[PDB]
């Protein structure tokens, strides 16, 4: 093969052992097989190249080929993209992916490509945040008085505020003790985090609020992409989608196993009606639609 | 509206040192890469240097590296270009610019009006 291989490079914040890393490695292996060795992918994990914004910057300049980035994370640079991580806008992942393919999604992806040389190949489901507490939460009404810990993130703050709770920003490192001692009444995170940090050990209740649905977009530097042959483009396109279907199924399966596990562990799992939460988010939706000067959210919410 | 104003242009010696400055206003400074460009009379607008949002990383044109030094003060909303060992070919209008990312495939979003530097001996 005088033409040699093409060794692409992929950066990620996540570390060996994680689902993101295992999916990246599956992507490396898939590309190498489907190309018969002509496309290889080198992985750089654990933020060895910087954080996600540093890595996107290396994509913009063609110094790095592939990275992950949340759809909503684009709102830092394309303000309307933030609509997709306002709480309760995405109902489930299929809905988030519908937004990615919609006229709105497509307009965000054309701006990503034109302004910053980012070509979004796919969106992969990466889990939904849920709510633990020291008392059961069976409707939005139980949220009143609830000292809910959140990270110091705008949308996490907004979920707790507009649900009626008492937002309590606090460093992740303090959370477990604050729960154990009822300095705080609850917190919110994906289920794997709840398991890994043993928050279920000091929280008797889990509520399936489904308030924040996450993804990871797979993004390739446009400078790389233009350099590639059309067959190589197709192998990459297909492999990313194939690995994303497996990624998405892995996350969904693990969530279902974890809810089952929590129930079997004596965690009390509730399922509040969510239209009351979507309705309680309206003030923020129309504020967002105003500061953007255009009805974005309601269209997205309807998809 | 982010606005950028450049100061410090002079005429100066060949082999001389000159510090240019840029005052940025209008938005969270640290959300923006800051760049210096320059355009000489017969040539096209040309990249010179750029500095990342925190200053952790910087970028330089080949023609200027090792003797120019870009820096920023996120407390003062300033970016600076320390030019050492100037050379007649450095002569141009120098422009401050801002963007969310450093980019080579297009213009930065925002631009000052520029400051004239001339070096001759």
Residue numbers in the entry:
A (entry chain A): -3 to 299
B (entry chain C): 1 to 121
Direct quotes from the study:
The tripartite ATP-independent periplasmic (TRAP) transporters enable Vibrio cholerae and Haemophilus influenzae to acquire sialic acid, aiding their colonization of human hosts. This process depends on SiaP, a substrate-binding protein (SBP) that captures and delivers sialic acid to the transporter. The relatively strong interaction of sialic acid (Neu5Ac) with SiaP is the first step in the transport cycle, after which the ligand-bound SBP is recognized by the SiaQM protein in the bacterial inner membrane. Two of the nanobodies were found to strongly inhibit Neu5Ac binding and we used X-ray crystallography to determine the structure of VcSiaP in complex with a nanobody that allosterically inhibits sialic acid binding to this SBP.
A quantitative binding analysis by ITC revealed a dissociation constant (KD) of 162 nM for the VcSiaP/VHHVcP #1 complex and a KD of 13 nM for the VcSiaP/VHHVcP #2 complex. The VHHVcP #2/VcSiaP structure has a slightly larger ( + 15%) interaction area of 639.3 Å2 as determined by the PDBePISA server. The interface is centered around F101 on CDR 3 of the nanobody, which penetrates into a largely hydrophobic cluster at the surface of VcSiaP, formed by residues R49, Q53, W73, F112 and W114. Also notable is cation-pi interaction between VcSiaP R49 and VHHVcP #2 W53 with a distance of 3.6 Å. Interestingly, the VHHVcP #2/VcSiaP interface has fewer electrostatic and polar interactions than found for VHHVcP #1 despite the higher affinity (and drastically larger binding enthalpy). Considering the strong inhibitory effect of VHHVcP #2 on Neu5Ac binding, it was surprising that the VHH does not bind in the Neu5Ac binding site of the SBP, indicating an allosteric mechanism of inhibition. Interestingly, VHHVcP #2 binds close to a region of VcSiaP (residues 70–100) that undergoes a large number of relatively small-scale structural rearrangements between the open- and closed structures of the protein. Overall, the most striking difference between apo VcSiaP and our VHHVcP #2 complex structure is the area surrounding W73 of VcSiaP, which is itself forced into a slightly different conformation and thereby creates the pocket that accommodates F101 of the nanobody. Thus, F101 of VHHVcP #2 acts as a steric wedge or door-stop that prevents closure of the Neu5Ac binding site of VcSiaP. Since the epitope of VHHVcP #2 is remote from the Neu5Ac binding site and because of its strongly inhibitory effect on the function of VcSiaP, the nanobody clearly acts as an allosteric inhibitor.
